[PDB]
PDB file of C-alpha atoms and ligand atoms in Angstrom:
ATOM      1  CA  UNK D 275     125.155 108.130 179.367  1.00  0.00           C
ATOM      2  CA  UNK D 276     122.002 107.457 177.358  1.00  0.00           C
ATOM      3  CA  UNK D 277     119.755 104.406 177.383  1.00  0.00           C
ATOM      4  CA  UNK D 278     120.018 101.905 174.527  1.00  0.00           C
ATOM      5  CA  UNK D 279     117.949 101.309 172.477  1.00  0.00           C
ATOM      6  CA  UNK D 280     117.680 105.028 171.889  1.00  0.00           C
ATOM      7  CA  UNK D 281     115.264 106.821 169.587  1.00  0.00           C
ATOM      8  CA  UNK D 282     116.328 110.215 168.278  1.00  0.00           C
ATOM      9  CA  UNK D 283     113.569 112.203 166.548  1.00  0.00           C
ATOM     10  CA  UNK D 284     114.580 113.988 163.333  1.00  0.00           C
ATOM     11  CA  UNK D 285     112.023 116.827 163.213  1.00  0.00           C
ATOM     12  CA  UNK D 286     110.659 117.299 159.722  1.00  0.00           C
ATOM     13  CA  UNK D 287     112.798 114.499 158.342  1.00  0.00           C
ATOM     14  CA  UNK D 288     116.271 114.490 156.941  1.00  0.00           C
ATOM     15  CA  UNK D 289     117.517 117.006 154.398  1.00  0.00           C
ATOM     16  CA  UNK D 290     120.786 117.335 152.461  1.00  0.00           C
ATOM     17  CA  UNK D 291     123.513 118.991 154.594  1.00  0.00           C
ATOM     18  CA  UNK D 292     122.167 117.481 157.829  1.00  0.00           C
ATOM     19  CA  UNK D 293     124.955 115.920 159.900  1.00  0.00           C
ATOM     20  CA  UNK D 294     124.225 113.330 162.595  1.00  0.00           C
ATOM     21  CA  UNK D 295     126.963 112.497 165.104  1.00  0.00           C
ATOM     22  CA  UNK D 296     126.871 109.466 167.402  1.00  0.00           C
ATOM     23  CA  UNK D 297     129.478 108.997 170.123  1.00  0.00           C
ATOM     24  CA  UNK D 298     129.816 105.836 172.151  1.00  0.00           C
ATOM     25  CA  UNK D 299     131.979 102.924 173.215  1.00  0.00           C
ATOM     26  CA  UNK D 300     131.716  99.382 171.882  1.00  0.00           C
ATOM     27  CA  UNK D 301     131.094  96.844 174.624  1.00  0.00           C
ATOM     28  CA  UNK D 302     133.629  94.071 175.186  1.00  0.00           C
ATOM     29  CA  UNK D 303     132.564  90.955 173.267  1.00  0.00           C
ATOM     30  CA  UNK D 304     130.045  92.982 171.258  1.00  0.00           C
ATOM     31  CA  UNK D 305     128.152  91.130 168.556  1.00  0.00           C
ATOM     32  CA  UNK D 306     126.273  93.843 166.674  1.00  0.00           C
ATOM     33  CA  UNK D 307     125.427  97.530 166.360  1.00  0.00           C
ATOM     34  CA  UNK D 308     122.518  98.985 164.419  1.00  0.00           C
ATOM     35  CA  UNK D 309     121.444 102.416 163.229  1.00  0.00           C
ATOM     36  CA  UNK D 310     117.907 102.465 161.802  1.00  0.00           C
ATOM     37  CA  UNK D 311     116.675 105.531 159.915  1.00  0.00           C
ATOM     38  CA  UNK D 312     112.909 105.035 159.917  1.00  0.00           C
ATOM     39  CA  UNK D 313     109.992 106.192 157.763  1.00  0.00           C
ATOM     40  CA  UNK D 314     107.074 104.957 159.843  1.00  0.00           C
ATOM     41  CA  UNK D 315     107.404 101.180 160.018  1.00  0.00           C
ATOM     42  CA  UNK D 316     109.823 101.119 157.068  1.00  0.00           C
ATOM     43  CA  UNK D 317     113.583 101.318 157.571  1.00  0.00           C
ATOM     44  CA  UNK D 318     115.025 103.643 154.942  1.00  0.00           C
ATOM     45  CA  UNK D 319     118.638 102.921 155.949  1.00  0.00           C
ATOM     46  CA  UNK D 320     119.786 100.079 158.248  1.00  0.00           C
ATOM     47  CA  UNK D 321     123.518 100.300 159.130  1.00  0.00           C
ATOM     48  CA  UNK D 322     124.534  97.063 160.871  1.00  0.00           C
ATOM     49  CA  UNK D 323     128.112  96.275 161.921  1.00  0.00           C
ATOM     50  CA  UNK D 324     128.415  92.564 162.724  1.00  0.00           C
ATOM     51  CA  UNK D 325     131.414  91.492 164.806  1.00  0.00           C
ATOM     52  CA  UNK D 326     131.109  87.749 164.175  1.00  0.00           C
ATOM     53  CA  UNK D 327     129.341  86.638 161.011  1.00  0.00           C
ATOM     54  CA  UNK D 328     130.948  83.267 160.278  1.00  0.00           C
ATOM     55  CA  UNK D 329     134.046  84.500 162.139  1.00  0.00           C
ATOM     56  CA  UNK D 330     134.290  87.570 159.912  1.00  0.00           C
ATOM     57  CA  UNK D 331     133.580  91.220 160.677  1.00  0.00           C
ATOM     58  CA  UNK D 332     131.281  92.892 158.157  1.00  0.00           C
ATOM     59  CA  UNK D 333     129.013  95.906 157.854  1.00  0.00           C
ATOM     60  CA  UNK D 334     125.596  95.166 156.367  1.00  0.00           C
ATOM     61  CA  UNK D 335     123.416  97.952 154.954  1.00  0.00           C
ATOM     62  CA  UNK D 336     119.841  97.480 153.800  1.00  0.00           C
ATOM     63  CA  UNK D 337     116.322  98.899 153.513  1.00  0.00           C
ATOM     64  CA  UNK D 338     113.142  97.347 154.943  1.00  0.00           C
ATOM     65  CA  UNK D 339     109.875  97.999 153.097  1.00  0.00           C
ATOM     66  CA  UNK D 340     106.467  96.617 154.068  1.00  0.00           C
ATOM     67  CA  UNK D 341     108.265  94.377 156.579  1.00  0.00           C
ATOM     68  CA  UNK D 342     110.567  92.847 153.934  1.00  0.00           C
ATOM     69  CA  UNK D 343     114.328  93.338 153.730  1.00  0.00           C
ATOM     70  CA  UNK D 344     115.823  94.222 150.353  1.00  0.00           C
ATOM     71  CA  UNK D 345     119.158  93.475 148.711  1.00  0.00           C
ATOM     72  CA  UNK D 346     122.049  93.789 151.160  1.00  0.00           C
ATOM     73  CA  UNK D 347     125.049  96.038 150.537  1.00  0.00           C
ATOM     74  CA  UNK D 348     128.120  94.799 152.398  1.00  0.00           C
ATOM     75  CA  UNK D 349     131.372  96.525 153.359  1.00  0.00           C
ATOM     76  CA  UNK D 350     134.326  94.469 154.591  1.00  0.00           C
ATOM     77  CA  UNK D 351     136.266  97.480 155.879  1.00  0.00           C
ATOM     78  CA  UNK D 352     135.499  97.344 159.606  1.00  0.00           C
ATOM     79  CA  UNK D 353     136.662 100.291 161.741  1.00  0.00           C
ATOM     80  CA  UNK D 354     134.971  99.327 165.020  1.00  0.00           C
ATOM     81  CA  UNK D 355     136.883  97.674 167.840  1.00  0.00           C
ATOM     82  CA  UNK D 356     135.436  95.878 170.846  1.00  0.00           C
ATOM     83  CA  UNK D 357     135.908  97.886 174.024  1.00  0.00           C
ATOM     84  CA  UNK D 358     136.899 101.114 172.308  1.00  0.00           C
ATOM     85  CA  UNK D 359     135.264 104.520 171.773  1.00  0.00           C
ATOM     86  CA  UNK D 360     133.965 105.471 168.362  1.00  0.00           C
ATOM     87  CA  UNK D 361     132.436 108.366 166.475  1.00  0.00           C
ATOM     88  CA  UNK D 362     129.905 107.714 163.714  1.00  0.00           C
ATOM     89  CA  UNK D 363     128.992 110.627 161.465  1.00  0.00           C
ATOM     90  CA  UNK D 364     126.182 110.381 158.929  1.00  0.00           C
ATOM     91  CA  UNK D 365     125.995 113.220 156.414  1.00  0.00           C
ATOM     92  CA  UNK D 366     122.851 113.396 154.305  1.00  0.00           C
ATOM     93  CA  UNK D 367     123.688 114.213 150.696  1.00  0.00           C
ATOM     94  CA  UNK D 368     121.226 114.647 147.835  1.00  0.00           C
ATOM     95  CA  UNK D 369     121.647 111.091 146.506  1.00  0.00           C
ATOM     96  CA  UNK D 370     123.074 109.081 149.424  1.00  0.00           C
ATOM     97  CA  UNK D 371     123.876 108.816 153.077  1.00  0.00           C
ATOM     98  CA  UNK D 372     127.622 109.302 153.608  1.00  0.00           C
ATOM     99  CA  UNK D 373     129.073 107.540 156.657  1.00  0.00           C
ATOM    100  CA  UNK D 374     132.408 108.306 158.319  1.00  0.00           C
ATOM    101  CA  UNK D 375     133.780 106.533 161.392  1.00  0.00           C
ATOM    102  CA  UNK D 376     136.479 108.109 163.574  1.00  0.00           C
ATOM    103  CA  UNK D 377     136.845 110.814 160.901  1.00  0.00           C
ATOM    104  CA  UNK D 378     137.562 108.392 158.042  1.00  0.00           C
ATOM    105  CA  UNK D 379     135.170 107.905 155.154  1.00  0.00           C
ATOM    106  CA  UNK D 380     133.548 104.473 155.264  1.00  0.00           C
ATOM    107  CA  UNK D 381     130.701 104.118 152.770  1.00  0.00           C
ATOM    108  CA  UNK D 382     127.856 105.737 150.864  1.00  0.00           C
ATOM    109  CA  UNK D 383     124.341 104.313 150.670  1.00  0.00           C
ATOM    110  CA  UNK D 384     122.214 105.398 147.720  1.00  0.00           C
ATOM    111  CA  UNK D 385     118.730 106.583 148.688  1.00  0.00           C
ATOM    112  CA  UNK D 386     116.159 103.841 148.089  1.00  0.00           C
ATOM    113  CA  UNK D 387     113.465 105.631 150.102  1.00  0.00           C
ATOM    114  CA  UNK D 388     113.127 108.936 148.292  1.00  0.00           C
ATOM    115  CA  UNK D 389     110.720 110.855 150.559  1.00  0.00           C
ATOM    116  CA  UNK D 390     113.570 112.184 152.667  1.00  0.00           C
ATOM    117  CA  UNK D 391     111.310 114.501 154.685  1.00  0.00           C
ATOM    118  CA  UNK D 392     109.384 111.443 155.930  1.00  0.00           C
ATOM    119  CA  UNK D 393     112.497 109.780 157.412  1.00  0.00           C
ATOM    120  CA  UNK D 394     111.864 111.262 160.837  1.00  0.00           C
ATOM    121  CA  UNK D 395     113.300 108.877 163.452  1.00  0.00           C
ATOM    122  CA  UNK D 396     116.722 107.358 164.113  1.00  0.00           C
ATOM    123  CA  UNK D 397     116.908 104.235 166.262  1.00  0.00           C
ATOM    124  CA  UNK D 398     120.226 103.299 167.875  1.00  0.00           C
ATOM    125  CA  UNK D 399     120.650  99.797 169.259  1.00  0.00           C
ATOM    126  CA  UNK D 400     123.096  97.014 169.952  1.00  0.00           C
ATOM    127  CA  UNK D 401     126.179  96.341 172.015  1.00  0.00           C
ATOM    128  CA  UNK D 402     127.340  99.847 172.882  1.00  0.00           C
ATOM    129  CA  UNK D 403     127.456 102.357 175.674  1.00  0.00           C
ATOM    130  CA  UNK D 404     125.923 105.466 174.088  1.00  0.00           C
ATOM    131  CA  UNK D 405     127.458 108.804 175.059  1.00  0.00           C
ATOM    132  CA  UNK D 406     125.789 111.341 172.769  1.00  0.00           C
ATOM    133  CA  UNK D 407     123.562 111.531 169.698  1.00  0.00           C
ATOM    134  CA  UNK D 408     122.983 114.894 168.022  1.00  0.00           C
ATOM    135  CA  UNK D 409     122.480 116.613 164.685  1.00  0.00           C
ATOM    136  CA  UNK D 410     123.348 119.928 163.074  1.00  0.00           C
ATOM    137  CA  UNK D 411     123.366 121.551 159.642  1.00  0.00           C
ATOM    138  CA  UNK D 412     126.623 122.182 157.822  1.00  0.00           C
TER     139      UNK D 412
HETATM  140  O1  LIG P 160     119.679  92.613 155.586  1.00  0.00           O
HETATM  141  C1  LIG P 160     119.545  93.264 156.824  1.00  0.00           C
HETATM  142  C2  LIG P 160     118.970  92.345 157.871  1.00  0.00           C
HETATM  143  O2  LIG P 160     119.598  91.078 157.959  1.00  0.00           O
HETATM  144  C3  LIG P 160     119.029  90.152 158.893  1.00  0.00           C
HETATM  145  S1  LIG P 160     120.013  88.588 158.762  1.00  0.00           S
HETATM  146  C4  LIG P 160     119.698  87.842 157.147  1.00  0.00           C
HETATM  147  C5  LIG P 160     120.780  88.293 156.133  1.00  0.00           C
HETATM  148  O3  LIG P 160     121.918  88.847 156.626  1.00  0.00           O
HETATM  149  C6  LIG P 160     121.099  87.013 155.201  1.00  0.00           C
HETATM  150  N1  LIG P 160     121.543  87.462 153.870  1.00  0.00           N
HETATM  151  C7  LIG P 160     122.877  87.566 153.476  1.00  0.00           C
HETATM  152  C8  LIG P 160     122.930  88.048 152.155  1.00  0.00           C
HETATM  153  C9  LIG P 160     124.176  88.317 151.319  1.00  0.00           C
HETATM  154  C10 LIG P 160     124.248  89.264 150.262  1.00  0.00           C
HETATM  155  C11 LIG P 160     125.454  89.472 149.545  1.00  0.00           C
HETATM  156  C12 LIG P 160     126.622  88.759 149.857  1.00  0.00           C
HETATM  157  C13 LIG P 160     126.586  87.813 150.920  1.00  0.00           C
HETATM  158  F1  LIG P 160     127.648  87.142 151.232  1.00  0.00           F
HETATM  159  C14 LIG P 160     125.367  87.620 151.625  1.00  0.00           C
HETATM  160  N2  LIG P 160     121.541  88.227 151.819  1.00  0.00           N
HETATM  161  N3  LIG P 160     120.775  87.893 152.806  1.00  0.00           N
HETATM  162  C15 LIG P 160     118.997  90.562 160.348  1.00  0.00           C
HETATM  163  O4  LIG P 160     118.189  89.650 161.044  1.00  0.00           O
HETATM  164  C16 LIG P 160     118.259  91.910 160.270  1.00  0.00           C
HETATM  165  N4  LIG P 160     118.067  92.539 161.608  1.00  0.00           N
HETATM  166  C17 LIG P 160     119.063  92.957 162.500  1.00  0.00           C
HETATM  167  C18 LIG P 160     118.446  93.528 163.642  1.00  0.00           C
HETATM  168  C19 LIG P 160     119.092  94.109 164.883  1.00  0.00           C
HETATM  169  C20 LIG P 160     118.358  94.385 166.064  1.00  0.00           C
HETATM  170  C21 LIG P 160     118.981  94.931 167.207  1.00  0.00           C
HETATM  171  C22 LIG P 160     120.349  95.224 167.219  1.00  0.00           C
HETATM  172  C23 LIG P 160     121.117  94.963 166.049  1.00  0.00           C
HETATM  173  F2  LIG P 160     122.382  95.228 166.039  1.00  0.00           F
HETATM  174  C24 LIG P 160     120.470  94.412 164.905  1.00  0.00           C
HETATM  175  N5  LIG P 160     117.063  93.427 163.356  1.00  0.00           N
HETATM  176  N6  LIG P 160     116.859  92.880 162.209  1.00  0.00           N
HETATM  177  C25 LIG P 160     118.983  92.937 159.305  1.00  0.00           C
HETATM  178  O5  LIG P 160     120.298  93.079 159.782  1.00  0.00           O
END
């Protein structure tokens, strides 16, 4: 039963074969969730499920550099459900982040920030009850 927003340090940055697992429950009437992999003030990977963008559900992914957002990558497959428990897994691969939700592959995000060892914090925010956030090496 962790506090949101939650900041999870990633000691020494991310590395290929690192697996991050987030367990929680989506609040009723949730509007948004966000995972922010941070390199200092920059956001290397922003993963942003939106439950009502013009009455559509969409996942927006982006990178923020020098306080400016880049080109969005959008995914219309939406596995989250208001009120229900979820599992997000982020596997770091050499050329992308690989995201699975409830054990089903969802998307890959090509690395725009290439100093992977400097991506050393994960922020978790939005309309969820957070149960656990951890990492391991596979
Ligand atoms: O990009 C990423 C950014 O977006 C902006 S909103 C502006 C664009 O969404 C508009 N737009 C559409 C398009 C486009 C591109 C292709 C197709 C198409 F149809 C449209 N191009 N630009 C949003 O404020 C940003 N944010 C979210 C949060 C946040 C904080 C706490 C909790 C939480 F859950 C989230 N903090 N900052 C972050 O999410």
